[PDB]
Design a protein around this ligand. Structure first.
Ligand SMILES: CO[C@H]1O[C@H](CO)[C@@H](O)[C@H](O[C@H]2O[C@H](CO)[C@@H](O)[C@H](O)[C@@H]2O)[C@@H]1O
Ligand SMILES: CO[C@H]1O[C@H](CO)[C@@H](O)[C@H](O[C@H]2O[C@H](CO)[C@@H](O)[C@H](O)[C@@H]2O)[C@@H]1O
Ligand SMILES: *[C@@H]1O[C@H](CO)[C@@H](O)[C@H](O)[C@H]1NC(C)=O
Ligand SMILES: *[C@@H]1O[C@H](CO)[C@@H](O)[C@H](O)[C@H]1NC(C)=O
Ligand SMILES: [Ca+2]
Ligand SMILES: [Ca+2]
Ligand SMILES: [Mn+2]
Ligand SMILES: [Mn+2]
Ligand code: NA
Ligand code: NA
Ligand code: NA
Ligand code: NA
Ligand code: NA
Ligand code: NA
Lengths: 241, 241
């Protein structure tokens, strides 16, 4: 598998190529609703939902010293009646058998377990998070404001940028990885043009195994909001260093 | 799933995204060998092997009047000690649960059943075949020469072009479907530039279900040859009519 690409303009309730985990489901109006809702569509507490694309990605190959580039383009929106809505949505990459960890319904975003969430040697997760909940006596690892972060085997982001959450508004995101510069970059844009950029140097060959799956995760703990993925397109190609 | 693309520059023995059927196997030299060989690598009688890509393709959608384009580019070579090597290799599209039919190890190319092989209403197969065996008292449906054919729910090709088999030589093939003209085109070239073209008008929405898998099939009956797929790339995008 030297390359893979796919796109979802919207989401099909009869989709065949998506592994859904936890509370994730595709709605009648073709939106991927990651976190659980009640029967009126209102967000609920203590929920994780994730999706992965079914086909595995060859992220790198040691025998040929190849590493893949990738791009992930997606749009999402969040809704909540709360002044401190939680917890957030993330694009992520993990081993193919990745499953929702225990204790992840909350600030761990469905991605980490409490005992190991800040121990990089215990994890294999690369993620780009949109984090709306940052209370300093609880999400102690966060900066004290809403933020976009790049997470490298830890819920404490390697780097963040201050972000503004906008109730019901769709954010457009492009995540790219350049293996020649080992740079993971993120550009997020709201409809009025407000832009957010964050990037880190990261060697994926030390973070993740050779074969991975890619997808999204979201969670709510005591505070809550819906996490709605509208669309997603992904591409990856193995390249020589 | 609104688009899918993938590429195999060669074949990984540890590939994750290929469904292998029958005798198909990936060699230590990264070649997909569709038909069975003995302990010395010599081709044998009465064998079928097929592969499908794991991710399903949405080829069309009735309720929205969408139909997908597709392109499939691939290379293969055939080897045999026989004067009448058989039976051939085909790129094919079929329902996602497609399995090797009984009686298909021979001129039916792993694609059709003997009692229904020329009854279009009984089948759901679109294929581009490279057919090396054409004995008129046996493969009665074939022209009396080696040929490339487009098969629309029948082993009797809707159209063929005369072809020359070249022992051990790689043929490079591009198959494309244009939904706006309903045209399926095939262009095949040998390394010296010798070219073969064949095309048909076919409405895939009357041939195949909305979701399909794509792949290759090969078979040998009483006469035999190896069928070696070297590389394959595919793309499909679902579009409005
Ligand atoms: C009001 O909720 C805040 O205060 C509570 C009492 O101290 C905390 O338990 C609570 O933490 C949980 O919810 C948050 C927000 O969903 C989540 O990030 C965290 O991991 C816990 O699940 C929160 O700080
Ligand atoms: C010597 O093989 C030829 O003659 C036999 C007796 O007439 C046929 O049975 C035989 O047909 C089988 O093999 C061919 C070639 O592999 C295959 O195309 C066909 O479907 C049968 O399996 C062949 O004509
Ligand atoms: C971090 O994780 C490693 C690997 O699982 C473990 O051996 C180590 O004890 C952990 N360290 C801390 C400080 O928790
Ligand atoms: C062709 O197949 C159809 C559908 O399976 C069947 O009803 C019909 O009898 C067949 N026609 C033949 C064998 O001539
Ligand atoms: Ca947080
Ligand atoms: Ca034949
Ligand atoms: Mn954070
Ligand atoms: Mn034929
Ligand atoms: Na692939
Ligand atoms: Na909702
Ligand atoms: Na798959
Ligand atoms: Na995880
Ligand atoms: Na051979
Ligand atoms: Na006939």
């Amino acid at each position: 598998s030297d390359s893979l690409s796919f796109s979802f303009i919207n989401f099909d309730k009869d989709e065949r190529n998506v592994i859904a985990q936890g509370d994730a489901r595709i709605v009648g109006n073709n939106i991927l609703q990651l976190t659980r809702t009640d029967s009126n569509g209102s967000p609920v507490k203590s929920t994780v939902g994730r999706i992965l694309y079914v086909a595995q990605v060859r992220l790198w190959e040691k025998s040929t010293n190849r590493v893949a580039n990738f791009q992930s383009q997606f749009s999402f929106f969040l809704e909540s009646p709360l002044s401190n809505p939680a917890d957030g949505i993330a694009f992520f990459i993990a081993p193919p058998d990745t499953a929702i960890p225990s204790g992840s319904a909350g600030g761990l975003l469905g991605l980490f377990s409490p005992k190991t969430a800040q121990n990089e040697s215990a994890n294999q997760v690369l993620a780009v998070e949109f984090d709306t909940f940052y209370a300093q006596n609880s999400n102690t690892w966060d900066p004290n404001y809403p933020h976009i972060g790049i997470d490298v085997n830890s819920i404490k982001s390697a780097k963040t940028v201050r972000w503004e959450r906008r109730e019901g508004v769709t954010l457009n995101v492009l995540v790219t990885y350049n293996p020649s510069t080992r740079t993971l970059d993120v550009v997020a844009t709201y409809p009025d043009g407000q832009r957010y950029d964050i990037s880190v140097v990261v060697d994926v060959t030390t973070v993740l195994p050779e074969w991975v799956r890619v997808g999204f995760s979201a969670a709510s703990g005591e505070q809550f909001q819906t996490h709605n993925l509208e669309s997603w397109s992904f591409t990856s190609t193995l390249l020589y260093t």
